[PDB]
């Protein structure tokens, strides 16, 4: 055939891939974390948006830190061979490097490690997108007039 | 013959390192609102980094907090694209 380039990921596998949306709105009273009003608007917008991109969307609501880790582990052990990519959306409280389950925190590194090229071989070489709506600390940006 | 085990990840953060992220209780979060809008408008047109750059500009320019508390009033947000991708990403093909 003619000359070829490979500057772009192959996105014409039979499936675009999974879109896991973790929507944490209500937190265990003992954590002292407030409810995240408006997050259901986010979860619904994401579901529709990624549905139109032909992702297999799975919405999950109010997961404990244990459920988050087990979900990510189980998803990483699926056969992604026929899928172009992987998307995970996290909607929760957070701080730098951390996302909160309903009962306590989860290291972002623990979540993403399941999808390392050596630990999820059927996603190796494929784009793994983590979209994170969560605080990364407590600084506020005062902005500057244009 | 090998690729890095950390290759081919992209982290689309809502906010800069060390900062709060803003969520509106009626409209949803600034970042997710803007992300869905730009995916809706540009997923059949633009490479994903260029989509996320439009998201950055939308959040940075169109949003500013309103609070009865002076500490939290009139604040801004810039999202933070962290790419360890090795190729361009288009959601369309052919």
């Amino acid at each position: 055939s003619g000359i070829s380039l490979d500057n772009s990921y192959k996105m014409d596998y039979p499936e675009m891939g999974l879109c896991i949306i973790i929507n944490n709105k209500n937190f265990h009273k003992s954590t002292g974390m407030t409810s995240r009003s408006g997050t259901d608007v986010d979860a619904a917008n994401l579901r529709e948006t990624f549905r139109n991109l032909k992702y297999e969307v799975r919405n999950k609501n109010d997961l404990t830190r244990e459920e988050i880790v087990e979900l990510m582990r189980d998803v990483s052990k699926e056969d992604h061979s026929k899928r172009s990519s992987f998307v995970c959306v996290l909607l929760s409280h957070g701080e730098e490097g951390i996302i909160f389950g309903t009962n306590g925190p989860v290291d972002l590194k623990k979540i993403t490690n399941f999808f390392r090229g050596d630990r999820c071989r059927s996603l190796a070489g494929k784009p793994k997108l983590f979209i994170i709506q969560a605080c990364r600390g407590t600084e506020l940006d005062c902005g500057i007039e244009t | 013959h090998k690729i890095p085990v950390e290759a081919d990840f992209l982290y689309a953060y809502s906010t800069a390192p060390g900062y709060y992220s803003w969520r509106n209780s009626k409209d949803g979060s600034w970042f997710i609102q803007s992300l869905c809008a730009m995916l809706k408008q540009y997923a059949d047109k633009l490479e994903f980094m260029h989509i996320l750059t439009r998201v950055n500009r939308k959040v940075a320019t169109e949003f500013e907090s309103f609070s009865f508390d002076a500490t939290f009033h009139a604040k801004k947000q810039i999202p933070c694209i962290v790419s360890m991708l090795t190729k361009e990403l288009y959601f369309y093909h052919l």
Binding site: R36, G38, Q133 | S21, W22, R23, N24, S25, F72
Partner: peptide, 4 residues
């Protein structure tokens, strides 16, 4: 407006 609220923070996360």
């Amino acid at each position: 407006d609220e923070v996360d």
